[PDB]
Design an enzyme around this catalytic site. Structure first.
Site, PDB file in Angstrom:
ATOM      1  N   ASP A   1       0.826  -1.199   0.000  1.00  0.00           N
ATOM      2  CA  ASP A   1       0.000   0.000   0.000  1.00  0.00           C
ATOM      3  C   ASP A   1       0.869   1.261   0.000  1.00  0.00           C
ATOM      4  OD1 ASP A   1      -1.943   1.895   0.299  1.00  0.00           O
ATOM      5  OD2 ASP A   1      -2.406   1.434   2.399  1.00  0.00           O
TER       6      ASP A   1
ATOM      7  N   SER B   1      -0.723  15.604 -12.030  1.00  0.00           N
ATOM      8  CA  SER B   1      -0.970  15.245 -13.411  1.00  0.00           C
ATOM      9  C   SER B   1      -1.219  16.508 -14.222  1.00  0.00           C
ATOM     10  CB  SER B   1      -2.172  14.300 -13.483  1.00  0.00           C
ATOM     11  OG  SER B   1      -2.592  14.063 -14.813  1.00  0.00           O
TER      12      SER B   1
END
Length: 330
Positions: A35, A199
């Site tokens: 994770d 992004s």
């Protein structure tokens, strides 16, 4: 040193991925959920409340000659999906894919929430976010990666998750045969303890690319892709009959649909998520309403590039002094 381990979807939907991890001496192999959105290595154990164990493999520290109680240490964690666990702490030898760390904090669960109990395939979590998020008190502990780092050939790990197929986590090297083209690297902020990056925009299907900054985290422990409501609405508007359902808890779509792809930007590069990756199947057995793999982050407080996004790429988690993230197509 390096390590290389195969990671395997737990079910037909790729809800999560498990990777075998050797703990203790002799080795006890547990299948852990790696994770990159948390920083605790915790396991089901001989200390876990019996009624809360249902099929998981447990770590038994008393059977490990290298286990040592970390006296006075406790841990307690709550995840974004509302699940939680807590317990005490041992140090022991932990190996992943041939890479061995001695003195790793292995957090032994005394209590786990129902969602963990109900998932027999996940024996615990191995956190790979920054150690500043580790919950051990009163002495915070380091992640497996942080402990291994100095010994690694290069201070990196990579995630290569499969779509309905196994994939790979590598530590200490970049497998130049595992991706196509080049890797595009992008800046990381560690201010919140995550692999947080921005992004450069998105496209829906064959549509034009929208240049827009989307701050979010690369999180292998989250199944879906969670993005701003504007972006998500633009995606689902291209699927006839798709709608957001408060009763179901997100966007659903007719199972008869063909889903468009979704593209996200990494600098000047582009990662394309095929439409099929966005299908999470019937909301309930036999239903013709299907659950979407792109959902709104509104009210999470953060955008999350979960497995839906990451499995479309070869992803480099570069833990150099100034960390960065790399993405390649594959």
């Amino acid at each position: 040193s390096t390590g290389s381990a195969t990671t395997t979807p737990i079910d037909s939907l790729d809800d999560a991925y498990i990777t075998p991890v050797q703990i203790g001496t002799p080795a006890q192999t547990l299948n852990l959920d790696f994770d990159t959105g948390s920083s605790d290595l915790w396991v089901f154990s001989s200390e876990t409340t019996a009624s809360e164990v249902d099929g998981q493999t447990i770590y038994t520290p008393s059977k490990s000659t290298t286990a040592k109680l970390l006296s006075g240490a406790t841990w307690s964690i709550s995840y974004g999906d509302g699940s939680s666990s807590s317990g005490d702490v041992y140090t022991d030898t932990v190996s992943v894919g041939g890479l061995t760390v001695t003195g790793q904090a292995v957090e032994s669960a005394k209590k786990v929430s129902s969602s963990f109990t109900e998932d027999s395939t996940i024996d615990g979590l191995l956190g790979l976010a920054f150690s500043t998020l580790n919950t051990v008190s009163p002495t915070q502990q380091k992640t497996f990666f942080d402990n291994a780092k100095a010994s690694l050939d290069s201070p990196v790990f990579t995630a290569d998750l499969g779509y309905h197929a196994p994939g790979t986590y590598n530590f200490g090297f970049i497998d130049t045969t595992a991706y196509t083209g080049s890797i595009t690297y992008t800046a990381v902020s560690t201010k919140q303890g995550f692999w947080e990056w921005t992004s450069t925009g998105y496209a829906v299907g064959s549509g034009t690319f929208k240049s827009t900054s989307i701050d979010g985290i690369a999180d292998t422990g989250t199944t879906l892709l969670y993005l701003p409501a504007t972006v998500v609405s633009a995606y689902w508007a291209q699927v006839s009959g798709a709608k957001s359902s408060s009763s179901v808890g997100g966007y659903v779509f007719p199972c008869s649909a063909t889903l468009p792809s979704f593209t996200f930007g990494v600098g000047s590069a582009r990662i394309v998520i095929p439409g099929d990756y966005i299908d999470f199947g019937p909301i309930s057995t036999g239903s013709s309403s299907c659950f979407g793999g792109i959902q709104s982050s509104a009210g999470i407080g953060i955008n999350i590039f979960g497995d839906v996004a990451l499995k479309a790429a070869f992803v480099v988690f570069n833990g150099a002094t100034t960390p960065t993230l790399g993405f390649a197509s594959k």
